[PDB]
Amino acid sequence: FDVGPRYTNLSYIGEGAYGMVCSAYDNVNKVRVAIKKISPFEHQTYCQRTLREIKILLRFRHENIIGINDIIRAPTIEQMKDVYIVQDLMETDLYKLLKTQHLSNDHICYFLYQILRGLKYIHSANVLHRDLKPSNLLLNTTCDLKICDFGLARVADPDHDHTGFLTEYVATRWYRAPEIMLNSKGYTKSIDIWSVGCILAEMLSNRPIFPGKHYLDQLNHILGILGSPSQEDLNCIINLKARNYLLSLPHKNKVPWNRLFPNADSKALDLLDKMLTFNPHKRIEVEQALAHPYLEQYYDPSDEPIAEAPFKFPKEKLKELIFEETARFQPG
Numbered sequence: 001f002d003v004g005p006r007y008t009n010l011s012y013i014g015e016g017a018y019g020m021v022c023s024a025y026d027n028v029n030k031v032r033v034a035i036k037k038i039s040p041f042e043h044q045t046y047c048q049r050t051l052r053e054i055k056i057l058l059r060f061r062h063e064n065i066i067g068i069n070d071i072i073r074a075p076t077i078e079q080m081k082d083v084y085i086v087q088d089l090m091e092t093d094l095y096k097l098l099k100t101q102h103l104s105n106d107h108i109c110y111f112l113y114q115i116l117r118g119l120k121y122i123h124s125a126n127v128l129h130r131d132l133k134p135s136n137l138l139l140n141t142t143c144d145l146k147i148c149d150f151g152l153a154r155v156a157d158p159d160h161d162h163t164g165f166l167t168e169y170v171a172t173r174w175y176r177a178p179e180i181m182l183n184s185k186g187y188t189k190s191i192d193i194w195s196v197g198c199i200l201a202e203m204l205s206n207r208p209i210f211p212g213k214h215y216l217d218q219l220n221h222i223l224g225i226l227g228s229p230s231q232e233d234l235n236c237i238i239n240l241k242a243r244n245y246l247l248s249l250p251h252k253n254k255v256p257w258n259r260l261f262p263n264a265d266s267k268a269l270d271l272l273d274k275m276l277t278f279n280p281h282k283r284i285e286v287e288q289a290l291a292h293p294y295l296e297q298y299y300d301p302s303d304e305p306i307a308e309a310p311f312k313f314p315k316e317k318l319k320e321l322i323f324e325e326t327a328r329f330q331p332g
């Protein structure tokens with residue numbers, strides 16, 4: 001971990017496929033920080049995702065979205081093998097927290113509020129995160145929450161969202177909206193809302209709500225709780241392979257949320273229901289979720305900011321863009 005004299009005394013924290021996140025002590029400001037060693041320069045896709053994330057986190061400024069404090073890299077493209085991204089150290093993440101801690105209703109409420117407040121800003125930028133999950137939600141010692149990991153994020157593209165049945169998808173399986181498996185590329189804001197719905201359900205029980213073990217088992221987990229889709233919702237799936245697959249399944253009845261979650265607040269289950277709607281057109285949006293009765297103690301739209309400037313949208317060209325996009329952190 002080659003992070004210069006600014007970042008002394010290191011540790012051992014998190015990991016990815018094309019990089020790794022750990023911890024060290026900062027000297028220009030006098031605090032411990034998080035640092036992630038990214039080495040993506042062998043693959044086009046991973047270069048694209050290092051670049052997506054850098055460009056987004058540098059444009060974004062919001063209290064519930066992780067920032068970049070520094071980027072450490074070689075002075076020349078030639079000498080640049082690794083990129084080190086420095087961020088505020090966060091005590092934990094919601095994944096780690098859910099495996100060890102019962103959350104009070106008051107924590108659940110506050111966490112959901114902050115996730116939606118961060119997500120309001122993201123979506124106001126015309127950006128989709130596309131991989132929200134407990135391990136991408138960071139928490140400090142006083143339960144302040146920041147959204148991290150924008151490597152699968154995209155500019156929204158609802159006019160190009162349609163695809164065939166069983167189209168491969170990249171984002172984490174347990175948090176995938178049912179339409180992903182049926183007819184959606186995940187190019188609409190509704191995809192993030194479904195994930196948030198899943199995270200909420202998981203905060204209520206400490207257990208993932210739809211833990212599918214493979215691509216199509218994911219859908220059948222979803223339908224086991226929501227029940228069979230209605231005729232109207234089925235008529236919105238025009239793709240015949242997808243429609244006929246749903247028609248081939250035995251009828252399933254809705255599992256009521258209060259049987260699944262008998263200790264949960266009844267307003268939290270009302271919001272859950274609206275986040276985990278099968279039909280993405282009927283699914284609650286982020287600003288309506290913030291306005292829901294469950295969040296009324298926190299709701300303040302003048303204190304839930306939006307982005308000033310939204311977005312509009314090979315490996316050798318991408319290294320040069322990564323080089324150009326990290327130039328501001330260099331000495332000189």
Ligand SMILES: Cn1nccc1Nc1nccc(-c2cc3c(s2)C(C)(C)N(CCN2CCOCC2)C3=O)n1
Nearest residue numbers: 014015016017018019034088089090091092093149
């Ligand atoms: C102590 N503690 N415990 C939990 C979380 C933390 N503190 C903490 N503070 C600040 C930032 C972070 C993280 C950032 C990122 C994290 S944690 C992950 C989720 C690993 N990630 C993706 C990495 N990519 C995946 C694809 O290949 C390339 C690498 C980040 O960008 N964490």
